[PDB]
Amino acid sequence: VQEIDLGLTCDMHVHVREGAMCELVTPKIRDGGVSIAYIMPNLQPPITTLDRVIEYKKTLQKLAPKTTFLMSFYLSKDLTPDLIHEAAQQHAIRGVKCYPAGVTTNSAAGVDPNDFSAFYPIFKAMQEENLVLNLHGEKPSVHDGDKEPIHVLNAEEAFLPALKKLHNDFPNLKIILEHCTSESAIKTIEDINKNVKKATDVKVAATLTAHHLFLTIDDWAGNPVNFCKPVAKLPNDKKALVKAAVSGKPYFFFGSDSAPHPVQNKANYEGVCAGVYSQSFAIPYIAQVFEEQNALENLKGFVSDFGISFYEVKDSEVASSDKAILFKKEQVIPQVISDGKDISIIPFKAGDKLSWSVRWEPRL
Amino acid sequence: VQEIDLGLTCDMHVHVREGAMCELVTPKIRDGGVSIAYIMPNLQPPITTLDRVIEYKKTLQKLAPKTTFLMSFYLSKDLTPDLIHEAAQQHAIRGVKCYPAGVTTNSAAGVDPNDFSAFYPIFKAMQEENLVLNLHGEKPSVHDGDKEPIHVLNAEEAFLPALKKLHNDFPNLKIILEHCTSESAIKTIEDINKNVKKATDVKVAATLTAHHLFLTIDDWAGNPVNFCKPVAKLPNDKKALVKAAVSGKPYFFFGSDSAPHPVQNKANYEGVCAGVYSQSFAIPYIAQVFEEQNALENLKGFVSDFGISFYEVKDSEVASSDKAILFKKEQVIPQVISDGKDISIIPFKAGDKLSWSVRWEPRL
Ligand SMILES: [Zn+2]
Ligand SMILES: [Zn+2]
Ligand SMILES: [Zn+2]
Ligand SMILES: [Zn+2]
C-alpha cells in the first residue's frame, strides 16, 4: 500500500548522548517514526548509578514528552547486585547493556568477555528482576601469534559461544544479541529458538539495524560515515540479515543503533568514531527494505509487535498513544543534520531520497 | 653498528604524482634507500601519450638526478600497437599498467577485467617489444546476481582467472600481479612458476608492498591512513605474504605502492583516498620485516636482485652507481612528511621506531 498503520513503533537500541547533541537528537526519535526507545548507557562516565539514570530520563522526557523511554545500566565494575534490585523495583531501568572493553564508542570501562564470571552475581540479580541483558556481542581483537586471531570480521562469530554459555547458565534471563551482522549469528539465534513458536517463549533475541540491511564492507572501506561496530560484513551476511528482518519471526526486531557523532569526529585520518546516525529517518529506512523484499505486511511485526512483546511493554508505560502512520510521500535526506550552533551530523544515506514519510495519529 | 650492502635497490611500484607533491616525494626515493623506481601512470589524465611520458620522466630526473626511472603507460583504449612500438623503440617506457575501472585512485577510466580481449593488439605489441604488463589485479565489485558477489576482500582472488588466461594467451609476455595481498594469489603465483629454475625463466611475478607485510583489516578499520587498495586482509593472508617476501623465490620482489595523498585527502568522512605513503623509509620498513623473520640474508634478493633480473635493468641505464647500505642505527618515523608549504603527508607507521637506517656508498 500507501499508508500503513504501524501503531506504537519500537526502536530497541538508541544513542542520544548528552548536552547539545542530546537536545538535537532526542526529538528526532519521534520525527523518525519511533514511539518507544531503549536508551543505551555508554555516556562519559557510563550510567552506573540510580540517580544518574533517573535524572537522564528526566532530561529526555523534557526534551521529548511524547516519547516512551526505557533505560539501562552500563555493565560495570562499579555495579553491585544490590543496586540491580533497587533500580528494578523503582522501575528506573529495563536492562543492563554489556560492552566488551575497547570494541566500540565509550567501551573503555567495559568487560572482558572471556571471563564473565565476576558478573554472575549481577546476572543472577538481573534474572530475578526480569531485566534484559543486552550484549554488544564482539570479542576484543587478538593478533598474538599462538591462538586464533580475532579481528573486526570474525569478532562477532567468536562471541557466539559466550552468548550460548550465558544463555545456558541463566535460562530464564531475557538476553539480546544487539545489532547482529553475520550469517553465523543469525544461525545461532535461529537455533536457540528451535522450538519456540509464537513470541512469548523467546528468551534470546537479536536486534537488527537499518544500516546493516543496506551496507557491506565495500560501503565503509573508504567511507567513514558508514563505519560502525560491528562492521558491515559480506554480501552473504547482509543477505542473511535482510532475510531475517522480513522473516516475520518473533526473535528478530528493530534496534537502530543510531549513534550520533559530530562530523569532525568522522573526518579523521585515524581513530574515526564508530557509528551510523539513523534516528531522523529510522522507520522510512526500514520501510524501503520491506518494500524491496515484497514484505510490507511483516513491517509492523518487525518495528512494533516483537519489540513490545519481548520487552513486555504495557500500555500503562507509554508516554503517548499516538500511532505511527507510514505514508508514501517522497523526501530527500539532507546532507547534514544541524542544531545551527556547533553540531553537524551526516545522516545515514545522506542525500538519498526515500519513498516513505511518517506522521503521527492519535488513537480515538 | 652492523651494515648490509644492498647494492642497487629497486622499488618496482612507485607513485610520485605531479606538481608540488611530486617535488616533495621524488627525492624521497633516494632517501628511503631506493636506487631504481618503476613509475606508475595513473595521473589525472593518465599517461597515454609519448610526449607526456617523455616530459614526466625528465621532470623526475630533474628532481632526483641520482635515481633511475623506469616509466609506464596507463592501459587505455587510446593506446595503439603503433604507439607501443614507437614508445618502446625510443626507450620511453618499460611497461604498461592495467587498472580495472573504479577499483582505486584514478582507475576509471580504466578497463573491464571481464574482457581484456579488446587490448590484445596492445599486448601483442608489448610482447614483441619486451614490455612488462603490470596488473592491479582486482575484479570490480559486484553484489547482485547471478554470480558469486565480488567485494574488497575477495576481489583479488576473483581476478586470478583473468591472470591465468592472460598468461595462457601470451606465454612470452612478462606479467606482474602488483601488490599481492592474499594467500590465494601467492599460491597462484608459485603454481604458475612451478617449473622455473633460474631467475631468468620467470615470466609472471608479483610485487609485495611494505605495508601489506605489517597490516591486517584491523589496522585500517577506523584508520583511513592505513586504507589502501587492494585492502589489507586477514592474518592468514599477512602470514603468507611475509613468507613469500622472505622466500628467496625470484618471482616475488619489492614494490612499495607508496601512494602519497595530502592529509586532508585522508581525513574525509566520505571518499577517503586509498593509499599508504612509504617512500621516505621504504627499505628500512622491509628490513624490519626481514629481521623479525630472521631472514636478512634474503633481503638483497627481494629489494634488489630479483627486480633487476625481471625488468632486465642494465648498468648502462643506471643513473647512479651508489650502493644502498643498511646500518643498524635506530630511528623514529616522524609524525608528518611536509614540504613546509601546503602539503603534509602522514607516513606509514608514523611515530614508530625502526631498527635500520640507510646510507649511500660509492662503488669500487
Ligand atoms: Zn554496540
Ligand atoms: Zn549501540
Ligand atoms: Zn594498485
Ligand atoms: Zn599503485
Handedness of CA B46, B49, B55, B58 (dihedral sign): positive
Other beta carbons within 10 angstroms of residue B276's beta carbon come to: 27
d(CA B284, CA B29): 12
Half-sphere exposure (CA, 13 Å, Cβ side) for A302? Answer: 29
User: Between B235-245 and B282-292, two packed helices, what is the crossing angle to 10 degrees?
Assistant: 100
Compute, in angstroms, the gap from residue A11 CA to the centroid of ligand 2: 11
Partner-chain residue, chosen from A152, A272, A346, that has the shortest CB–CB distance to B218: A152
Contact between B267 and A268 using a beta-carbon 8 Å cutoff: yes
> Which residues, by Cβ under 5 Å, contact ligand 4, an ion?
B 257
Place of cell 602519497: B260
Q: Are B20 and B315 in contact (CB under 8 A)?
A: no
DSSP string, A246-311: TS--TTEEE---B----GGGTS-SS-PPP-B--GGGHHHHHHHHHHHTT-GGGHHIIIIIHHHHHH
The residues, any chain, with a CB within 8 Å of residue A163's CB and separated by 6 or more, are A135, A137, A175, A177, A188, A204
Compute, in angstroms, the gap from residue B338 CA to the centroid of ligand 2: 39
Chain A closest-CA separation from residue B105 CA (Å): 11
Q: Are A242 and A213 in contact (CB under 8 A)?
A: yes
Residue type, position A193, single letter: N
d(CA B119, CA B80): 9
Contact between A272 and B149 using a beta-carbon 8 Å cutoff: no
Helix (H, G, I), strand (E, B) or coil at A97: strand
d(CA A260, CA A344): 10
d(CA A157, CA A154): 5
Helix (H, G, I), strand (E, B) or coil at B223: coil
Residue B169: C-alpha distances to residues A214, B124, B133, B156, B226 (Å) = 40, 10, 13, 20, 36
Other beta carbons within 10 angstroms of residue B157's beta carbon come to: 19
Long-range Cβ contacts of B138-141 (<8 Å, 24+ apart)? B138/B100, B138/B103, B138/B104, B138/B229, B138/B230, B139/B100, B139/B113, B139/B114, B140/B100, B140/B101, B140/B102, B140/B103, B140/B112, B140/B113, B141/A218, B141/B102, B141/B103
| For residue A284, cis peptide bond before it (omega within 30 degrees of 0) | no
Q: Please, which residues 150-169 of chain B have a Cβ atom closer than 8 Å to chain A?
A: 151-153
Place of cell 635515481: B67
- CA neighbor of A220 nearest in space, from B59, B227, B230, B291: B227
The nearest alpha carbon in chain A to B103 belongs to A218
The residues, any chain, with a CB within 8 Å of residue A341's CB and separated by 6 or more, are A20
d(CA B87, CA A162): 63
Using the CB atoms, write b or e for A190-204: b if 16+ within 10 Å. Answer: bebbeeeeeeeebbb
For chain B, the first-to-last Cα distance in angstroms comes to 22
Other beta carbons within 10 angstroms of residue B28's beta carbon come to: 23
Residue type, position B227, single letter: F
- CA neighbor of B177 nearest in space, from B9, B12, B48, B348: B12
User: Between B50-63 and B19-31, two packed helices, what is the crossing angle to 10 degrees?
Assistant: 60
Residue B351: C-alpha distances to residues A295, B191, B210, B278 (Å) = 53, 39, 16, 13
d(CA B180, CA B217): 15
Resolution (A): 2.1
Residue type, position A303, single letter: V
Residue A122 pairs with which residues in a beta bridge?
none
Cβ-based burial of A324 (10 A; exposed 0-12, middle 13-18, buried ≥19): buried
d(CA B236, CA B240): 6
Contact between A224 and B223 using a beta-carbon 8 Å cutoff: no
d(CA B172, CA A215): 43
Cell readout for A135 is: 550484549
Nearest ligand atom owner, CA of B100? 3
Q: What is the enclosing helix (H) or strand (E) of A358?
A: strand A357-361
CB-CB neighbors (< 8 A) of B143 in chain A: 216, 218, 235
Q: In what order do the strands lie in the sheet with A10-14?
A: A10-14, A36-39, A68-70
d(CA B356, CA B350): 15
Q: Please, which residues 253-312 of chain B have a Cβ atom closer than 8 Å to chain A?
A: 263, 266-274
Residue A282 pairs with which residues in a beta bridge?
none
The nearest alpha carbon in chain B to A263 belongs to B269
Chain B closest-CA separation from residue A262 CA (Å): 11
The nearest alpha carbon in chain A to B105 belongs to A222
Tell me which fold the domain A9-317 belongs to: TIM Barrel (3.20.20)
* Sequence positions preceding breaks in chain A, C–N over 2.5 Å: none
Chain B interface test: which of A157, A234, A265, A270 (most B C-beta within 10 Å): A270
CA torsion angle B225 B227 B229 B235 (round to 10): 120
> Which residues, by Cβ under 5 Å, contact ligand 3, an ion?
B 136
Residue A360: C-alpha distances to residues A6, A45, A322, B219 (Å) = 10, 35, 6, 45
Half-sphere exposure (CA, 13 Å, Cβ side) for A181? Answer: 27
CA torsion angle A8 A11 A12 A15 (round to 10): -140
Cell readout for B272 is: 577517503
Residue type, position B245, single letter: A
Long-range Cβ contacts of A47-53 (<8 Å, 24+ apart)? A47/A71, A47/A72, A47/A73, A47/A74, A48/A73, A48/A74, A48/A76, A48/A78, A48/A79, A49/A78, A49/A83, A50/A83, A50/A86, A50/A87, A50/A90, A50/A92, A53/A87, A53/A92, A53/A93
Using the CB atoms, write b or e for B191-213: b if 16+ within 10 Å. Answer: ebbeebeebeebbbbbbbbbbbb
DSSP string, A24-83: HHHHHHHHTT-SEEEE----SS---SHHHHHHHHHHHHHH-TTSEEE-EEE--TT--HHH
Q: What is the DSSP-derived secondary structure letter of residue B240? A: H
User: What pairing do the DSSP bridges indicate for beta strands A72-74 and A68-70?
Assistant: unpaired
Chain A interface test: which of B144, B151, B227, B229 (most A C-beta within 10 Å): B151
d(CA A103, CA A139): 8
Tell me which fold the domain B8-318 belongs to: TIM Barrel (3.20.20)
Half-sphere exposure (CA, 13 Å, Cβ side) for A36? Answer: 29
* CA A347 remoteness from chain centre: 16
Partner-chain residue, chosen from B152, B267, B271, that has the shortest CB–CB distance to A217: B152
B350 in contact with A, Cβ within 8 Å: no
Please work out, in degrees rounded to the nearest 5, the angle formed at the alpha carbon of residue A120 by the alpha carbons of A119 and A126.
95
- CA neighbor of A217 nearest in space, from B217, B363, B273: B217
Other beta carbons within 10 angstroms of residue A326's beta carbon come to: 26
The nearest alpha carbon in chain B to A275 belongs to B222
DSSP string, A206-221: EEE-SGGGT--HHHHS
